[PDB]
Amino acid sequence: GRGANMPFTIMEAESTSNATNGTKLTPNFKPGDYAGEASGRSSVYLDATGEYVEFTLTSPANAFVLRNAVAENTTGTVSIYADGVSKGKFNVSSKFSYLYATPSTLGRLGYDNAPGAGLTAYWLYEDAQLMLDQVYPAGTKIKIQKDAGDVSWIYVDLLETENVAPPQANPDPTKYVAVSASKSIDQALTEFRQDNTKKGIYIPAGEWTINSKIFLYGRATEIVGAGPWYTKLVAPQSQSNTDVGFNISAAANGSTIRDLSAWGNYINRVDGPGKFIDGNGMQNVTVQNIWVEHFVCLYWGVNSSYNTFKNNRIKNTFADGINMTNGSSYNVIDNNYARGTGDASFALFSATDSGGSYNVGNKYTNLTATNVRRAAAFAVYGGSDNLFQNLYGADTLTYPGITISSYSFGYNTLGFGDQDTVIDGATLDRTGGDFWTSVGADDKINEYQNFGAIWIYGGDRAIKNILIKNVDINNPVYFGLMFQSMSPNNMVMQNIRVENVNINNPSRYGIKLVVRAEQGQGPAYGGASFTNVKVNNPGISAIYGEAQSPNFTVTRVSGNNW
Numbered sequence: 001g002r003g004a005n006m007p008f009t010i011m012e013a014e015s016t017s018n019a020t021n022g023t024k025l026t027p028n029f030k031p032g033d034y035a036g037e038a039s040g041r042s043s044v045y046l047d048a049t050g051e052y053v054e055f056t057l058t059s060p061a062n063a064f065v066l067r068n069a070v071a072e073n074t075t076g077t078v079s080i081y082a083d084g085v086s087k088g089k090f091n092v093s094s095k096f097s098y099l100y101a102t103p104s105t106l107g108r109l110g111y112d113n114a115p116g117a118g119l120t121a122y123w124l125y126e127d128a129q130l131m132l133d134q135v136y137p138a139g140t141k142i143k144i145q146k147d148a149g150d151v152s153w154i155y156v157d158l159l160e161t162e163n164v165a166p167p168q169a170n171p172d173p174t175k176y177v178a179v180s181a182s183k184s185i186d187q188a189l190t191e192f193r194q195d196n197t198k199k200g201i202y203i204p205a206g207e208w209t210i211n212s213k214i215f216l217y218g219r220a221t222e223i224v225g226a227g228p229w230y231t232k233l234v235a236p237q238s239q240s241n242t243d244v245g246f247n248i249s250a251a252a253n254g255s256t257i258r259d260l261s262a263w264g265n266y267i268n269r270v271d272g273p274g275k276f277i278d279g280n281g282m283q284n285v286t287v288q289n290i291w292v293e294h295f296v297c298l299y300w301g302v303n304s305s306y307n308t309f310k311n312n313r314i315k316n317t318f319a320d321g322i323n324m325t326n327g328s329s330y331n332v333i334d335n336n337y338a339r340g341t342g343d344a345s346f347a348l349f350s351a352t353d354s355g356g357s358y359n360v361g362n363k364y365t366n367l368t369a370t371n372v373r374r375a376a377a378f379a380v381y382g383g384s385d386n387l388f389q390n391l392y393g394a395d396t397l398t399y400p401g402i403t404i405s406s407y408s409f410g411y412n413t414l415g416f417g418d419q420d421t422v423i424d425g426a427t428l429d430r431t432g433g434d435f436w437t438s439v440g441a442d443d444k445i446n447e448y449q450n451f452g453a454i455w456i457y458g459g460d461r462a463i464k465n466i467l468i469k470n471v472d473i474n475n476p477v478y479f480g481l482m483f484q485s486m487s488p489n490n491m492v493m494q495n496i497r498v499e500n501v502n503i504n505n506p507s508r509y510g511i512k513l514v515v516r517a518e519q520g521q522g523p524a525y526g527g528a529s530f531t532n533v534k535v536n537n538p539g540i541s542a543i544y545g546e547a548q549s550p551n552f553t554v555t556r557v558s559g560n561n562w
């Protein structure tokens with residue numbers, strides 16, 4: 001009931017509703033582990049010819065996405081059956097998975113694709129997409145099976161199913177110049193610009209190369225596809241880390257991109273390039289119903305305002321999904337789905353290194369973000385008057401479900417401003433995790449620093465006016481809520497409120513006031529108010545750190561069972 005409303009249905013392979021003659025992993029929360037990195041922290045291991053997982057369709061489907069893990073540096077197949085009749089072969093491959101690092105060098109996570117001595121493999125799961133020539137009814141038994149000739153072994157994590165409409169044709173051949181076998185995207189855009197009666201271009205079903213950053217200028221431009229399953233923009237797969245996509249300047253304010261998919265060719269993170277859409281001051285641009293993969297980001301906006309991001313799918317990128325800096329204001333990020341982003345899936349960063357003030361007035365609504373391969377599902381870094389509402393986040397590999405931080409990351413930065421940053425209506429399932437190193441740390445349980453479902457981090461910038469309300473935190477890895485001040489700046493927390501929050505079976509505490517994260521770090525400064533904040537069945541205590549935090553005040557307004 002919370003998050004994005006998407007046309008596809010996700011079914012976990014390990015659900016005991018599904019018959020299998022293979023191996024269900026028992027869950028853990030461990031990076032670089034096939035259960036830890038899986039959706040729902042488990043998957044079904046198919047290991048020998050004839051092993052299968054049998055799903056039952058709850059909704060008709062003609063298209064299927066298998067999130068899976070196969071061996072490093074292999075491509076192959078796994079079989080799919082409909083009611084016991086074999087119907088195709090998924091094309092599975094570890095070409096975009098397996099990024100290498102070390103427990104002590106987790107800052108390199110996402111950047112290094114080559115195996116080497118002493119390196120652990122992370123980011124183990126990738127996706128295979130398959131469309132079948134039949135719409136199958138609900139109640140169909142869809143069997144994922146390892147036949148002779150299929151890959152040696154495979155971890156089956158989940159299957160999304162979708163009933164995909166037929167491809168939409170050119171809305172009007174007189175108003176949209178058509179990409180074709182003889183006409184490239186670039187050429188169609190030239191003809192559009194040069195003929196004032198055209199509203200833009202139509203990209204039809206098929207696979208179209210994008211080896212370029214396509215700049216949209218001149219006037220508001222409409223870029224329309226036949227559907228994400230049918231219109232595929234394809235970065236050249238023979239190459240790697242090719243910066244392609246769209247750049248939308250202010251000349252093309254009011255432009256539209258919709259109903260297509262873009263398949264990148266990145267195999268590791270690169271900082272600078274790699275965004276599918278570049279927003280430099282763009283305004284009133286609508287990005288709608290696109291499906292992006294294997295880019296660094298879907299979108300990175302710079303001082304772009306009044307834009308709409310609606311119904312998109314962001315899967316398997318190497319850094320953020322959607323992020324915005326430099327006074328990017330009054331944008332609507334509504335009804336988007338993210339899975340397997342390589343950094344925070346949905347974020348707002350008030351960086352001012354390009355002459356912009358606060359990110360203000362933005363709305364991040366009906367969002368779903370799972371399997372965050374690094375950092376948080378939702379991250380808010382400074383800003384003012386920004387709303388995060390009706391969110392579902394789950395299975396972060398390393399970090400909180402929600403990060404609220406005034407840390408500059410080394411840039412010219414504004415902290416939180418005069419109006420509340422609000423987080424209203426969130427469900428976070430199995431969020432938090434392990435990252436960085438915990439040398440000299442208090443409350444030390446392992447090699448790493450441990451992160452609660454929600455992290456309130458005072459950095460080197462002001463941290464104030466934060467309202468967290470109507471949040472359900474189910475089985476966090478460690479804590480529900482975690483308050484932490486960076487030393488030595490010791491920025492004081494004012495006007496933090498937590499209302500109607502349930503923390504269900506946190507393994508350690510429901511509330512952790514960080515006392516010494518690291519050598520050189522001290523307790524948190526400021527305070528926070530608590531109303532109807534319920535901690536149910538903690539592992540150790542309901543709240544940790546109160547007595548050791550003399551510079552932090554806990555205001556128990558009412559309703560608190562701790």
Ligand SMILES: OC[C@H]1O[C@H](O[C@@H]2[C@@H](O)[C@@H](O[C@@H]3[C@@H](O)[C@@H](O)O[C@H](CO)[C@H]3O)O[C@H](CO)[C@H]2O)[C@H](O)[C@@H](O)[C@@H]1O
Binds near residue numbers: 344
């Ligand atoms: O305005 C800051 C710069 O943004 C771009 O750089 C990004 C990098 O800084 C980095 O961003 C981090 C990001 O992933 C996020 O989750 O956490 C931090 C704060 O929210 C960010 O610092 O990596 C991103 C992906 O490669 C970069 O997009 C611009 O390219 C750069 O010119 C700006 O200076």
Ligand SMILES: OC[C@H]1O[C@H](O[C@@H]2[C@@H](O)[C@@H](O[C@@H]3[C@@H](O)[C@@H](O)O[C@H](CO)[C@H]3O)O[C@H](CO)[C@H]2O)[C@H](O)[C@@H](O)[C@@H]1O
Binds near residue numbers: 399436449
């Ligand atoms: O995955 C989180 C981000 O990683 C990178 O940014 C780093 C900062 O988050 C930060 O990390 C600190 C870490 O070194 C250790 O000291 O713990 C601190 C808190 O307990 C962390 O805040 O600082 C580093 C230097 O600026 C950054 O390397 C990526 O740049 C960013 O994209 C990620 O979102």
Ligand SMILES: [Ca+2]
Binds near residue numbers: 039040041043
């Ligand atoms: Ca699973």
